[PDB]
Every structure is written in C-alpha cells, then in structure tokens.
Amino acid sequence: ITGTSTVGVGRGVLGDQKNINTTYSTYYYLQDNTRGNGIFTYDAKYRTTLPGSLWADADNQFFASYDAPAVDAHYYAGVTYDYYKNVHNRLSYDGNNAAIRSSVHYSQGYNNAFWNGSQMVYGDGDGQTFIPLSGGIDVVAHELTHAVTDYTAGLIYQNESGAINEAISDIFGTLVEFYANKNPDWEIGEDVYTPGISGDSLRSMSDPAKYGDPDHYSKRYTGTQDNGGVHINSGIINKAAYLISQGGTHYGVSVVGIGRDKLGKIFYRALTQYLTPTSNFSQLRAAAVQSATDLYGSTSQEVASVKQAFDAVGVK
C-alpha cells in the first residue's frame, strides 16, 4: 500500500519485545519499506485461502497474543533479507528485490510451514507438536531459502535433489540463526517444537541420527514417503555441512573444520553457480569441491575439508 514508513513495537511468539517496520495509511500495516521492494505480512485468519489480508493494526503496537506470529514472521523475514544482502550480495530471493510475502494463522492446528511457489505460509501448530512456527528464526530462514533455491538451482522436490533442497534450507536457516546470534545452534526448529519437551528439536545437523535421520549415505531412505525422504535424507547433507564448518571424526573419518562463514560461501556458490534441478548427492559433492576451489584454491585446506566431509558421510 502507499503510505509512510513507520516503526511499531510488539512481542513475538516467545514473549520477546522487538521493533517492526510498518507503513501508515489510516491503519498501520505490516509492510516494511526499508528492504528491497518490501516485506509484507498477511493474516490468513485460520483459513487456507492465500495470502489473506495485509496485516492491519490500529495503533502500531503488536502485543496481543494473536499478533505474535505476525511480528516474528515479519521481523525474521527482515533478518533473513539482511543476511542474504550483507553476506552474499543477494537482493531478495530472486536477486532483484522481489517483494517478500508471508501469511500467518494458516489453517487450524497446522503443524508445518511452507513456500507455496509465491509466498511463505506459517501454521500456528496444535500447541503439542508445534507452537506458531514463525517463532523460529531458523524456520523462517528455511522457508525463504526455499524461494532462493527455486530461483537458482531449482532442485526438484523429490529424492536426492529434494534432500539437497531441504538441506540447503536447513544450512541457511542455521546460518541466519547464527547471524542474528540469539541462542544459535545446529538444531532445526528447537524454539517452536514440542513446547512440553525441553532440549529437543525437529532435526539435528550435528547428529541427525538423534531424531532418526541418516548420517551416512549407506543409511539413506529409498522408499516413497515424504517425496522420497526429502526431510530424512537431508540429514546426510546436513551432517556433511556441519562437519565442514565445525570439524569432527565421523565413522572414523576426520574432518578439519573451516568455520561457518566459509561453509556459507561454499554452499551459496554451489547453489547459485553449479547445482541444477536434478543434481544428486555426488553432483553436490563435485559442486562444493569446485566452489571451494574457485574461492580458496585447489591446494587449500577448504577444498580438502569439503572432500573429507563428503567422505565421512559416504558420498563420492
């Protein structure tokens, strides 16, 4: 909408106060004009018709319980935009400052979040498996990263390419969580998963097997559930990425860690210059090796560590 840029204040899903960029024209809207061609947050009103209504508020204060998922979807989309622009010189998901749209309060008891081809969509959860999913910065960044993937490598959402697609979203979701630097970890969704159980998470990148996901290619899922295991076999790539950054010895193979920033540079370059819609895990290894070679040189520690990490997870 046309209006003037304003700054509201509210409370997110976890109860934390934050400032949000809004737009005033009769109402205060969740429309942040400070980033690209805007970040827009919508109310789906417990229904499934999208996007719903651009979020309107009478007073620019967002402290109601109903407001909390919108506050966080809006704010964490801003952090994710900043990460891509400041760290990778990428302007929004399309590289040309496309408007970023999110809807919250999608459906009833909805234990998921997704990119629908055009926008991000967040359930509220059922209060048992999830609380409103936009409360996780890693979740928000995971969702926006699906848009980045779709505009770049285009990894088809099934089988190995789909597991790479998933892992890319978990990797960058985690790197955004570290960028914001509030309780960062290598776990996925811990802030919004299972409010009655402390210390768990939906997935672990450092130890995927803790939640039943494979940490070696010999343990990959080959059935048809979950689009051929896209949220399962992502553990193999998530573990490789964790090892590249943090190091470790895994199934007897030692990896020298090179840190998160270099992990992000390598995987961003692979995603945007080498991967294709049909890339498989072996092709991801080759893309990561070539990316590290471009950035750091063929004789570099970084190249050697990429090779060690893929060896450790059984991907040649």
Binding site for ligand 6NG (CB under 6 A): 112-117, 133, 139, 142-143, 146, 157, 188-189, 202, 226, 231
- Which of Ca ion, ligand 6NG, Zn ion, none lies near 57, with the C-beta cut-off 5 to 8 A by kind? Ca ion
Structure tokens that stand for 144 in this block: 């926006």
Smallest distance from the beta carbon of 59 to Ca ion, in angstroms? Answer: 4
Q: Which of 57, 70, 59 is nearest to 18 (CA)?
A: 70
74 catalytic? Reply is no
Q: Which entry of Ca ion, ligand 6NG, Zn ion, none binds 281, CB below 5 to 8 A by partner kind?
A: none
Whether 177 has a binding-site annotation, put simply, is: yes
Q: Is 183 a binder of Ca ion (CB under 5 A)?
A: yes
How far is Cα 25 from Cα 2, in angstroms, rounded to an integer?
7
Q: Has 138 been labeled as part of a binding site?
A: yes
Residue 159 marked ligand-binding: no
Q: How far is the CB of 75 from Ca ion (least distance, A)?
A: 16
Q: Which amino acid is at 293?
A: T
Give yes or no: 302 in active site.
Answer: no
Contact pattern from residue 70 through residue 89 relative to Zn ion, giving x for each residue in contact according to CB under 5 A and a dash for the rest: --------------------
Which residues are bridge partners to 7 per DSSP? 21
SS3 label, residue 142 = helix
200 binds Ca ion (CB under 5 A): yes
197 counts as binding Ca ion under rule CB under 5 A = yes
- Rounded CA-CA distance 88/90 in Å is 5
Report 57-96 residues binding Ca ion (CB under 5 A).
57, 59, 61
Nearest alpha-carbon partner for 51 in 61, 37, 59, 41: 41
Does residue number 169 form part of the binding site for Zn ion (CB under 5 A)?
A: yes
190 marked ligand binding residue = yes
Q: Phi then psi for 6, rounded to 5 degrees? A: -135, 170
Gap between the Cα atoms of 26 and 13, Å rounded: 26
- Annotated binding residue 142: yes
Both tokens of 95, joined, read 């590289």
Catalytic hit among 143, 160, 250, 302: 143
Residue with smaller CB distance to ligand 6NG, 131 or 287? 131
The neighbour count for residue 206, using CB atoms within 10 Å, is 17
Write the burial class of residue 94 (CB in 10 Å: 0-12 exposed, 13-18 middle, 19+ buried).
middle
> Could you give the residue numbers annotated as active site?
143, 231
Q: Which residues bind Ca ion (CB under 5 A)?
A: 57, 59, 61, 138, 177, 183, 185, 187, 193-194, 197, 200
